Design a protein around this ligand. Structure first.
Ligand SMILES: NC(=O)c1ccc[n+]([C@@H]2O[C@H](COP(=O)([O-])OP(=O)(O)OC[C@H]3O[C@@H](n4cnc5c(N)ncnc54)[C@H](O)[C@@H]3O)[C@@H](O)[C@H]2O)c1
Ligand SMILES: CC1(C)CCC(Cc2cc(O)c(-c3ccccc3)c(=O)[nH]2)CC1
Length: 268
C-alpha cells in the first residue's frame, strides 16, 4: 500500500520536468494520491509536461496575481474532484523574481516595483492560496510550500532571499488560520536543485561570475552535508514533501523541514 492512498492533493507551479513541483507530483502519485494540478500562463506547454506523470490529472489555470483566478479557484477545484469532496493537501511550489533582484545585478539597483512583484508571487501568494482553498480542506489536511534557507545572506540570491524570509513569516500566520480547519502548514527548505533555469545559469546566460557563484554554492553545499547533496536528484526533496502531506507528521505546523542533507547544520 502507498503512503497517501486516496488522498486528494492540489499541486502548483509545474513548468518543466525538472521543476520540483513535477517531482513532488510524480512521487505523490506513486504513493497513490489523486492530484489536481494548477499551472500558470503557458497552459499549453504545462499540459504536455504533465502527461508524463504516472497518472494523468486535471489541469486548472492559476495566476496568483490574478484576483479572479483566486476567487474562482475554490470552486473550479471542487468541480474537478466532484462536490462533497474535499482536499487533503495543497502544495505551493511557486516563486519568481526579476533579474534585478537575483543574479549578478547589484543588490541596490532593484526598483521596488520589481521586488514587489517578486514578493507578491513568492511569499504573498502562499496566504492567497491558503485563503482560497482552506474552506474545501479536510481535517488532518496539510499545506506545504517551497523554501530556500534565508536566515543568512549570500551572493546573487539578493531580493529573493528577502522574499523567502517573508515567506517563512507568512507560513507561521497561515499556520494560525489553518489550525481552525484542523490543517497543518509547513515549508520545505531544500538544498539547491539542478533545474532547467539553474543549468542555463551555469552557462553564461545569467552572466559569467553568476555561473561561478552558482557552482561555488552547489559545491560547498555537498561538502557541508554529512550525507551529501546531489543537486541533480530532486527525489529526496519530493519524498520529504510527501512525508508532510502524509499522516506521519501530525504534530508539526508553522514549521520548516530541511531537505538539504543537513547542510544548514554544518559550518564547514
Ligand atoms: N531552485 C531551487 O533549487 C530551489 C531550492 C529551494 C526552494 N526552491 C523553491 O521551489 C519553488 C519552485 O522552484 P523550481 O526550481 O521548481 O522553479 P520553477 O520555475 O520550475 O517553479 C516555479 C513555478 O512558479 C510558477 N509561477 C511563476 N509566476 C507565477 C504566478 N504569477 N502565478 C502562479 N505561478 C507562477 C512557474 O510557472 C513555475 O512553474 C520556488 O518557490 C523556489 O523558490 C527552489
Ligand atoms: C544562491 C544561488 C546562487 C541562487 C539560487 C539558489 C537556489 C534557488 C532558489 C530559488 O528559489 C530559485 C527560484 C527562483 C525563482 C523561481 C523559481 C526558483 C532558484 O532558481 N534557485 C542556488 C544558488
Amino acid at each position: 500500500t502507498g503512503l497517501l492512498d486516496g488522498k486528494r492533493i492540489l499541486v502548483s507551479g509545474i513548468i518543466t520536468d525538472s521543476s520540483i513541483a513535477f517531482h513532488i507530483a510524480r512521487v505523490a502519485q506513486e504513493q497513490g494520491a489523486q492530484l489536481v494540478l494548477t499551472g500558470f500562463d503557458r497552459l499549453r506547454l504545462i499540459q504536455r509536461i504533465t502527461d508524463r506523470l504516472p497518472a494523468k490529472a486535471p489541469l486548472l489555470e492559476l495566476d496568483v496575481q490574478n484576483e479572479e483566478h483566486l476567487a474562482s479557484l475554490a470552486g473550479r477545484v471542487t468541480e474537478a474532484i466532484g462536490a462533497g469532496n474535499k482536499l487533503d493537501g495543497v502544495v505551493h511550489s511557486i516563486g519568481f523574481m526579476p533579474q534585478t533582484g537575483m543574479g549578478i545585478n547589484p543588490f541596490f539597483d532593484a526598483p521596488y516595483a520589481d521586488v514587489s512583484k517578486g514578493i507578491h508571487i513568492s511569499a504573498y501568494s502562499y496566504a492567497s492560496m491558503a485563503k482560497a482553498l482552506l474552506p474545501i480542506m479536510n481535517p488532518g489536511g496539510s499545506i506545504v510550500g517551497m523554501d530556500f534557507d534565508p536566515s543568512r545572506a549570500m551572493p546573487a540570491y539578493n531580493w529573493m532571499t528577502v522574499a523567502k524570509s517573508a515567506l517563512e513569516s507568512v507560513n507561521r500566520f497561515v499556520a494560525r488560520e489553518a489550525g481552525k480547519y484542523g490543517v497543518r502548514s509547513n515549508l520545505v527548505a531544500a538544498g539547491p536543485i539542478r533545474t532547467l533555469a539553474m543549468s542555463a545559469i551555469v552557462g553564461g546566460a545569467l552572466g559569467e561570475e553568476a555561473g561561478a557563484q552558482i557552482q561555488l554554492l552547489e559545491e560547498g553545499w555537498d561538502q557541508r552535508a554529512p550525507i551529501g547533496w546531489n543537486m541533480k536528484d530532486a527525489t529526496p526533496v519530493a519524498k520529504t514533501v510527501c512525508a508532510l502531506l502524509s499522516d506521519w507528521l501530525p504534530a508539526t505546523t508553522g514549521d520548516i523541514i530541511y531537505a538539504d542533507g543537513g547542510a544548514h547544520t554544518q559550518l564547514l
